[PDB]
């Protein structure tokens, strides 16, 4: 509550008046496999601002410049999602948290 971030804006918002509890634990030792973990991503770029408790299921192409992409990508039209590329045998610091 009260924090900011690209995750907190385009991935998952949380109310300031949130009275609750959250549980997390390490679970990346078998839910992943070598070759980069593209299974779990995080949203970076989105044209419409998200509201609290709204789901992000759209995968629209990022629209980088003022000149509209409008279905055609290229210069100033770049893809909005990228993978993690983490290695499976790293510590929890390089690992996701299951919440």
């Amino acid at each position, epitope marked *: 509550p009260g924090q900011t971030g690209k995750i907190a804006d385009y991935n998952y918002k949380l109310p300031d008046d949130f009275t609750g509890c959250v549980i997390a634990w390490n679970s990346n030792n078998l839910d992943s496999k070598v070759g980069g973990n593209y299974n779990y991503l995080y949203r970076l770029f989105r044209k419409s601002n998200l509201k609290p408790f709204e789901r992000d299921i759209s995968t629209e192409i990022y629209q980088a*410049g*003022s*000149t*509209p992409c409008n279905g055609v990508e290229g*210069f*100033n039209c*770049y893809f909005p999602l990228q993978s993690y590329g983490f290695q499976p045998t790293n510590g929890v610091g390089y690992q996701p948290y299951r919440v």
Partner: antibody, heavy 118, light 114 residues
Framework: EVQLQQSGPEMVKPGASVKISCKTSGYTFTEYTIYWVKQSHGKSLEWLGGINPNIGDTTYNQKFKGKATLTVDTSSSTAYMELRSLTSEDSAVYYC???????????WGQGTLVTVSA | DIVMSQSPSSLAVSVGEKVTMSCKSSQSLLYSSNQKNYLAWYQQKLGQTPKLLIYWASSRESGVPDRFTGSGSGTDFTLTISSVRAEDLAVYYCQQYYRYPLTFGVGTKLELKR
């Protein structure tokens, strides 16, 4: 209030080096990017392009395409656009402009009205 | 689209009247989704690099001078200067940022009645 200011008198000799810089100010650099323009010293204005530095790939118009090695920096608050084989006829000022999520060339600086000999 | 470079040269414009900086767009207002237009105006006077004047062809920011008078839409664009004065006698240019390739046109170099 994003402000980018030019710098440096230009008397460019061909086959030489060039120092590319744009002092970005008024904003943390991870929010807004830089788009560049050349003025044809008294001809029609010439659009070239810019960069959104998230992956870095850019294509300009023909004259500014691939003469030199294209770089960018997302951290030290400098965008990069250069030329090789600079001649007198294209001896022009390196203009750069801040961007807005609505409009691309938003704010200029004082500018440099530079006349260049070879 | 085609990169705009006006020809033939002459299309008469007057100082102090409903001034017309004439450059047309090859596209209509048919913006496929949600109908947004992308129009600009950069006009070069002595030394000064032009700033933002017009965006999206209908709205300017608060503090933008009211010299711009809205007129024309679709495949045409024309801007009128309100009360052309000595500040308003300079070289004129127009620009749009809708599609590939992006370019700045030749503009209009002003001449006065005599």
């Amino acid at each position: 209030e994003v402000q980018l200011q030019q710098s440096g008198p230009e008397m460019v000799k061909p086959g030489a080096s060039v120092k590319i810089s744009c002092k970005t100010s008024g904003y943390t650099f991870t929010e807004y990017t830089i788009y560049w323009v050349k003025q044809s010293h008294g001809k029609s204005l010439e659009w070239l392009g810019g960069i959104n530095p998230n992956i870095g790939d850019t294509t300009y118009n023909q004259k500014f395409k691939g003469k030199a090695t294209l770089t960018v920096d997302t951290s030290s608050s400098t965008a990069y656009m250069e030329l090789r084989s600079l001649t007198s006829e294209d001896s022009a000022v390196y203009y750069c402009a801040r961007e807005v999520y609505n409009y691309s060339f938003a704010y200029w600086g004082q500018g440099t009205l530079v006349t260049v000999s070879a | 689209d085609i990169v705009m470079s006006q020809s033939p040269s002459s299309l008469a414009v007057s100082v102090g009247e409903k001034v017309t900086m004439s450059c047309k767009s090859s596209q209509s207002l048919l913006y496929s989704s949600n109908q947004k237009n992308y129009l600009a105006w950069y006009q070069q006077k002595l030394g000064q690099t032009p700033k933002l004047l017009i965006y999206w062809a209908s709205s300017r920011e608060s503090g933008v001078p009211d010299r711009f008078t809205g007129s024309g839409s679709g495949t045409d664009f024309t801007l009128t200067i309100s009360s052309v004065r000595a500040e308003d006698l300079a070289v004129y240019y127009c620009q749009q940022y809708y599609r590939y390739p992006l370019t700045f046109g030749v503009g209009t170099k002003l001449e006065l009645k005599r």
